């Protein structure tokens, strides 16, 4: 169902549960092992996640093995559970690529060694007028991402990449450096769906 | 002619000379006066005795003008010890805060 429970057999008890590591729809937690002698578990489902979870040493010095901390998060690797819709190469170095997925998510993947495969977070920056943000307050993900555009000319100084979503009346940018959404979406000002974005080099 | 007086002057009824010299120069007027030797502002600690001096002056005004102006009371002290209970749990719930960030 997606859940992962730790039983304790010297007390027949439940140390800690862990809810929704891997999503239930792709199978939930498929294989979740300890390591021989080590207090870290490695979990992988079918939704292209692979996490490891460390147990802390006990917090009470005298009693010890009856107050066990919940397992902390640690190093993880991850795809995005559905085939990607668009592919871009960020830098001229051929080091980082951008994958626009089909589960409505944008990721930055590495090519050298896979330590830095990370999702660009969809926390919208505040609109610059002094008032509150646009869009959904609840973190539901964006629409399906059709066509994007990418260059490295003035990276970091302002918004770098832009993209165009499925049947969305505007096309919104991101930032390659901060790895999140930029401020200004551009409407198409004609009441039409956006299909083809590009950027000056 | 004590019941015909507000809670603020029942608070500062004692130390009026420090009050008036603090008013006619530029200082800050006192807060306990004659109620400082009561049994509850000594129970409080810090500036909690200042806050308790104000709330106990207000309840002293309530109780005082009740049993000075009523003409049918049984002299049992009912709203007296009721106001004592209210001042006491007010004192407890204001000393129970801890302004040191834990």
């Amino acid at each position: 169902s997606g859940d992962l429970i730790f039983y304790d057999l010297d007390r027949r008890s439940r140390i800690h549960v862990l809810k929704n590591i891997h999503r239930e729809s792709y199978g939930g937690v498929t294989q979740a092992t300890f390591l021989n002698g080590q207090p870290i578990i490695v979990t992988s489902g079918g939704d292209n996640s692979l996490k490891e979870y460390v147990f802390d040493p006990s917090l009470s010095q005298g009693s010890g093995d009856v107050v066990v901390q919940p397992p902390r998060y640690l190093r993880s690797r991850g795809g995005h559970s559905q085939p990607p819709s668009y592919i871009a190469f960020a830098d001229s170095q051929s080091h980082f690529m951008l994958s626009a997925s089909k589960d409505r998510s944008l990721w930055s993947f590495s090519l050298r060694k896979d330590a830095q495969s990370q999702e660009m977070s969809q926390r919208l920056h505040k609109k610059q007028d002094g008032g509150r943000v646009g869009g959904s307050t609840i973190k539901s993900k964006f629409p399906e991402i059709v066509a994007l555009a990418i260059e490295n000319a003035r990276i970091g100084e302002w918004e770098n990449i832009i993209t165009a979503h499925k049947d969305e009346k505007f096309a919104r940018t991101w930032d390659m450096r901060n790895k999140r959404v930029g401020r200004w979406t551009f409407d198409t000002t004609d009441d039409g769906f956006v299909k083809s974005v590009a950027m000056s080099q | 002619s004590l019941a015909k007086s507000p809670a603020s002057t029942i608070q500062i009824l004692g130390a009026e000379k420090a009050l008036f010299r603090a008013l006619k120069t530029k200082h800050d007027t006192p807060k306990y006066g004659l109620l400082y030797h009561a049994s509850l502002v000594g129970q409080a600690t810090g500036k909690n005795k200042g806050k308790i001096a104000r709330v106990l002056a207000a309840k002293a005004a309530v109780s005082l003008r009740y049993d000075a102006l009523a003409e049918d009371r049984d002299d049992s002290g009912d709203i007296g010890l009721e106001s004592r209970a209210k001042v006491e749990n007010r004192l407890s719930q204001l000393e129970g805060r801890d302004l040191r960030t834990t």
């Binding site: - | 019941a3 015909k4 007086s5 507000p6 809670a7 603020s8 207000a58 005004a61 309530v62 003008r65 009740y66 049993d67 000075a68 102006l69 009523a70 709203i79």
Partner: protein, 121 residues
């Protein structure tokens, strides 16, 4: 409530609570019993309204004595929660004095209310 001397009727209660609403709009009143006695001693109060709904009535009827000494008009109203909701405070007040400002915008209704209060002694 036998010691509650003059308490208003329905229509007079309604018109004085609308004028105390306009007083709280224009910020021309001081609310609360001890504040009422403060402004009565320093002699600014046009009139006093007081609520005959508190469990002692002697918490307020000490200000009638100096109010009679200073000849100010004073009148009771049967609901302290009405006093609170009409004075603009989320707590049930007891007494309210209306301070004196001849350059107001509600001077004539304040004075008509003042005559309707001082007529019933």
């Amino acid at each position: 409530n036998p010691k509650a001397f003059p308490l208003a009727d329905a229509a007079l209660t309604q018109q004085i609570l609308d004028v105390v609403q306009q007083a709280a709009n224009l910020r021309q009143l001081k609310k609360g019993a001890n504040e009422a006695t403060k402004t009565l001693n320093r002699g600014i109060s046009e009139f006093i309204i007081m609520a005959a709904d508190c469990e002692p009535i002697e918490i307020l009827l000490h200000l009638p004595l100096l109010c009679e000494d200073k000849n100010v008009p004073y009148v009771f109203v049967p609901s302290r929660v009405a006093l609170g909701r009409a004075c603009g405070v989320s707590r049930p007040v007891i007494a309210a004095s209306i301070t004196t400002n001849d350059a107001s915008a509600i001077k004539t209704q304040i004075y008509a209310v003042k005559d309707k209060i001082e007529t019933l002694l």
